[PDB]
Design a protein around this ligand. Structure first.
Ligand SMILES: Nc1nc2c(ncn2[C@@H]2O[C@H](COP(=O)(O)OP(=O)(O)O)[C@@H](O)[C@H]2O)c(=O)[nH]1
Ligand SMILES: [Mg+2]
Length: 211
């Protein structure tokens, strides 16, 4: 009849834990599709928006974890505009697409704290290179604003934490739990009942200790 598919869109900078969070989710939900912009050649014929629509063709596949920073508003605009104009190449008219923003940078977080947390995660000439690339994404960062274009096209926003780890609880593991609880409440057809907490912890351990 009618199928609902989902595209999870981060708003993040480097080192906020996007890949760790998305890998944890995909370990829990192997049927979801994790597309990593960092794995795509900057001269690939099919770019991330193309691979996203390619994935959503199968009745198999209903979730794309769109793994890219999108720190700048123009990068969110690209997603909405490109998917909107190309989806009829791939999907029939019975497929409803929903866009879920995954906000990695709390609105009250200072740029200083954002830098301290992410820079220490990433380091822990090539150092200068990593640092200046990280500074570029932060320089371009425009916080999510659903009161105006383009972020008003999101169907839903999940607000994550970004903290120093406290009480031996990794920030990204807390965020995995936040996402699961939010989806169970707001999109109950997607995940029917929550995975066991020990399974979430193991799936996060796998992602965290990925080298
Ligand atoms: N201490 C700590 N490290 C984390 C956390 N989340 C991710 N990391 C680590 O921080 C680094 C960057 O995480 P990653 O998921 O690759 O960030 P990305 O650039 O947004 O994809 C990796 O070495 C992760 O293992 C966290 O909550 N706490
Ligand atoms: Mg990454």
């Amino acid at each position: 009849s009618t199928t609902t598919k989902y595209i999870f869109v981060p708003i993040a900078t480097i080192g906020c834990g996007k890949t760790t969070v998305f890998n944890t989710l995909n370990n829990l939900f192997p049927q979801w599709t994790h597309i990593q912009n960092d794995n795509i050649s900057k001269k690939a014929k099919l770019k991330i928006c193309d691979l996203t629509l390619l994935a959503l063709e199968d009745d198999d596949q209903s979730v794309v974890l769109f793994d890219r920073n999108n720190s700048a508003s123009r990068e969110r605009r690209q997603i909405f505009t490109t998917i909107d104009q190309k989806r009829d190449e791939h999907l029939d008219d019975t497929v409803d697409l929903k866009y879920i923003a995954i906000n990695f940078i709390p609105e009250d977080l200072s740029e200083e704290e954002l830098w301290d947390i992410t820079y220490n995660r990433v380091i822990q000439l090539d150092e200068n290179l990593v640092e200046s690339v990280m500074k570029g994404f932060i320089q371009r960062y425009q916080p999510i604003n659903t009161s105006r274009s383009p972020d008003d096209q999101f169907d839903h926003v999940i607000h994550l934490k970004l903290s120093k780890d406290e009480n031996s609880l990794k920030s990204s593991l807390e965020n995995v739990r936040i996402i699961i609880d939010d989806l169970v409440q707001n999109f109950p057809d997607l995940i029917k009942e929550k995975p066991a907490d020990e399974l979430i912890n193991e799936c996060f351990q796998k992602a965290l200790d990925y080298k």
